[PDB]
Design a protein around this ligand. Structure first.
Ligand SMILES: *[C@@H]1O[C@H](CO)[C@@H](O)[C@H](O)[C@H]1O[C@H]1C[C@](C)(N)[C@H](O)[C@H](C)O1
Ligand SMILES: [Cl-]
Length: 7
């Protein structure tokens, strides 16, 4: 998975 951004 992961995630991230930046928004
Ligand atoms: C975001 O993820 C990458 C992993 O590839 C790390 O290298 C990066 O340092 C990390 O960003 C940090 C710094 C930030 C953007 N302020 C946030 O705290 C994120 C969660 O962590
Ligand atoms: Cl991302």
């Amino acid at each position: 998975x992961x995630n991230x951004x930046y928004x």
